[PDB]
């Protein structure tokens, strides 16, 4: 359940996307599967992603709701159901403001937390700002709101949240509608405080939530804002003081100290946030309290490359480390971002370029919550 209000900020750096194209399950001819294109680490959020089949666009492509990581960079999963055959070739095309031309990537065949993420993007001339809100318990999304969608309601995105009655959905719809109007104002006062033109597109990002240990007791609370992918104002760990980044955010900080906004958030993050996280963990215990250990294997392909795989694991937190002769090798190694399979599980792999013949000197180390002991892989 969300915080009841969005306090007004008050009047007074681009990153290119990382692209991964992959199937949900290991590719098998004649077997139904899912083709994924995962884009992450990009800013701003406006992005155009196509899935290509034999040199043309696949028609029915869905994508996840816009969310972002701790560093404020966005991520999206584009996916479609498909049956790969022997001759068909697939790829993903991504267009972004950071790219001079669209990039094509071919398909080479027990702690807990509750998090709410908000993104507001101004569209000068092309309508009102785009507002997207998502709610997470750990790495499982359970609610969403899109200002461009037809329902104009907060919608369920996990089976266990559908239980909640109309008073829940009406209340979350009411709150998220007000948050949209608040950030529409916020974009205006930020444009004014920074003396920016009315024709430019800008982004307000908001994130808050609480962490609990394996005993379901409060650990940490968060509440931070960002303007155009840069820190604006953030609530410190004590949940009593604010960190302002510049003169514009200092004005917001003084208005929030005078209004005692931190005290409102502290009670929510230590009380309501914890209370409903436990209710969600209980109601969706079959999904949220599971742990899927990574199914691991090793791939080999003057020099040779060693690739350490980890598949179908939950939660997404994982560590893959390379080392030669028991010495952590943080050089000549490729580590991709953890990616969603689309079925609730996650994937990751680690690469290392080894001189041919010295392959058995390298070892891949896998740390995950579902593993009783950390694993060691070696060819």
């Amino acid at each position: 359940r969300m915080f009841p209000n969005a306090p007004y900020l008050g009047g007074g750096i681009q990153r290119t996307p990382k692209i991964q194209v992959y199937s949900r399950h290991p590719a098998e001819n004649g077997k139904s599967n899912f083709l994924n294109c995962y884009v992450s680490g990009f800013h701003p959020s406006d992005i155009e992603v196509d899935l290509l089949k034999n040199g043309e666009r696949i028609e029915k492509v869905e994508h996840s709701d816009l969310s972002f990581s701790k560093d404020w960079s966005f991520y999206l999963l584009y996916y479609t159901e498909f049956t790969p055959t022997e001759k068909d070739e697939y790829a993903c095309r991504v267009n972004h403001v950071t790219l001079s031309q669209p990039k094509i990537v071919k398909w080479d065949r027990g702690s807990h937390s509750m998090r709410y993420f908000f993104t507001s993007v101004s569209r000068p001339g092309r309508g009102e700002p785009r507002f997207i809100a998502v709610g997470y318990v750990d790495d499982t999304q359970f609610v969403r709101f899109d200002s461009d969608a037809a329902s104009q309601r907060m919608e369920p995105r996990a089976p266990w949240i559908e239980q909640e009655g109309p008073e829940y959905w009406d209340g979350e719809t009411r709150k998220v509608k007000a948050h949209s109007q608040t950030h529409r104002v916020d974009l205006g006062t930020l444009r004014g405080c920074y003396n920016q033109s009315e024709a430019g597109s800008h982004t307000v990002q908001r994130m808050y939530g609480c962490d609990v240990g394996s005993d379901w007791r409060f650990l940490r609370g968060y509440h931070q804002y960002a303007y155009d992918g840069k820190d604006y104002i953030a609530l410190k760990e004590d949940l009593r003081s604010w960190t302002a980044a510049d003169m514009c955010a200092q004005t917001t900080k003084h208005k929030w100290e005078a209004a005692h906004v931190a005290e409102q958030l502290r009670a929510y993050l230590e009380g309501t946030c914890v209370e409903w996280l436990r209710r969600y963990l209980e109601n969706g215990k079959e999904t949220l309290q599971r742990t899927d250990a990574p199914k691991t294997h090793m791939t080999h392909h003057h020099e040779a490359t060693l690739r350490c795989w980890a598949l179908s694991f939950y939660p997404a937190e994982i560590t893959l480390t390379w080392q030669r002769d028991g010495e952590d090798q943080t050089q000549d190694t490729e580590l991709v971002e953890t990616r969603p399979a689309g079925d609730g599980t996650f994937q990751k792999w680690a690469a290392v370029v080894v001189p041919s013949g010295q392959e058995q000197r390298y070892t891949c180390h896998v740390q995950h919550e579902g593993l009783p002991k950390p694993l060691t892989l070696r060819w």
Partner: nanobody
Amino acid sequence: EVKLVESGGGLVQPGGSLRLSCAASGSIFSINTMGWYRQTKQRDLVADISSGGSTKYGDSVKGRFTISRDNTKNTVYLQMNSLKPEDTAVYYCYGLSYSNDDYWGQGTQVTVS
């Protein structure tokens, strides 16, 4: 391997119209989707069409621009009606092979007074 010959650009008054054409040289089995992007750093989708005739348009040109194809000559056409000053850009023809290799033309300047 593949060459894209572009033509039909130039200067036009507001409200006027132009027709771009793009011809792919090589085998007819070498190119599926053909279309246009236009320069803004990035280049934005204008319109493209598959060999089977599946079209897609950028939001800023929907209703005014129309792409068509003569599959018997591997050549596409872009009828750009109701042109505005904001339509001024270099328009790059492009094509996709059936293995998802992209080919790009040098582009044609379009200027709307």
